């Protein structure tokens, strides 16, 4: 009887703390290793959030696993895009309150491009003047937005879970065609914006020279994900063609 929107509100994780010590010199290897460590933690937080998600637990495990594996990057980039929108109006990446990345430190090697792609997400929030509630329902739909070409085990429970959150975003729009059209195209563009961050992730993950550290959690997710993208057996759910 409390609305689904108010439940999403209370399972929303409190932002994690990085512990980045900008007392030492900034380097791109260090900063990337810190992002990934903060990332591995954010992801554990996002598993708890998914587990608390009305309906999510009703999928088979193979499905629950598939969905977090295929959307973790999308989840974290979407939240980062929000944090940057709220805390700095989309000007600077707010990775944590103790880690912001201004164009001083976009100027480090490797950083500019990947920080541009991330800011892009941020500026879409700025363009559309997204609400908090819009963001929350959209974020759930991100979790449900990439599936295997062979489909899921429990496709049935899945289709009805997506149905619920589609309605919920609908609600969120109105407690505030065209709007819904715009937001679902924003969802559609997350696959493209996120494919490129994934690609940079995979690059840093495999490149020996660069020595970027990943936590064991991520490393196993990324290691199992890299073959499936090689094969192109990963299917985006799109609202629009």
């Amino acid at each position: 009887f409390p609305t689904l929107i108010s439940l999403l509100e209370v399972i929303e994780p409190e932002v994690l703390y990085s512990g980045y010590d900008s007392t030492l010199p900034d380097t791109s290897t260090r900063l990337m290793s810190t992002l990934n460590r903060l990332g591995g933690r954010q992801v554990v937080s996002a598993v708890k959030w998914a587990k608390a998600l009305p309906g999510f637990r009703n999928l088979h495990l193979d499905d629950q696993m598939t969905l977090l594996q295929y959307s973790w990057m999308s989840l974290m980039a979407f939240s980062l895009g929000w944090r940057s929108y709220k805390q700095s109006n989309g000007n600077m990446l707010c990775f944590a309150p103790d880690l912001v990345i201004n164009e001083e430190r976009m100027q480090l090697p490797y950083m500019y491009d990947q920080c541009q792609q991330m800011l892009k997400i941020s500026s879409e929030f700025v363009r559309l003047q997204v609400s908090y509630d819009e963001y929350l329902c959209m974020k759930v739909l991100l979790l449900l937005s990439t599936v295997p070409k062979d489909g899921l085990k429990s496709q049935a429970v899945f289709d009805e879970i997506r149905m619920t959150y589609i309605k919920e975003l609908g609600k969120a729009i109105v407690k505030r065609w065209q709007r819904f059209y715009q937001l679902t195209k924003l969802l559609d563009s997350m696959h493209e914006m996120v494919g490129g961050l994934l690609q940079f992730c995979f690059y840093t993950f495999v490149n020996k020279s660069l020595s970027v550290e990943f936590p064991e959690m991520l490393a196993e997710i990324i290691s199992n994900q890299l073959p499936k993208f090689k094969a192109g057996s990963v299917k985006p759910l799109l609202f629009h063609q």
Partner: peptide, 11 residues
Amino acid sequence: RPAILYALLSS
């Protein structure tokens, strides 16, 4: 199948 993620979901 990635073992930590797997173990976290079946707790």
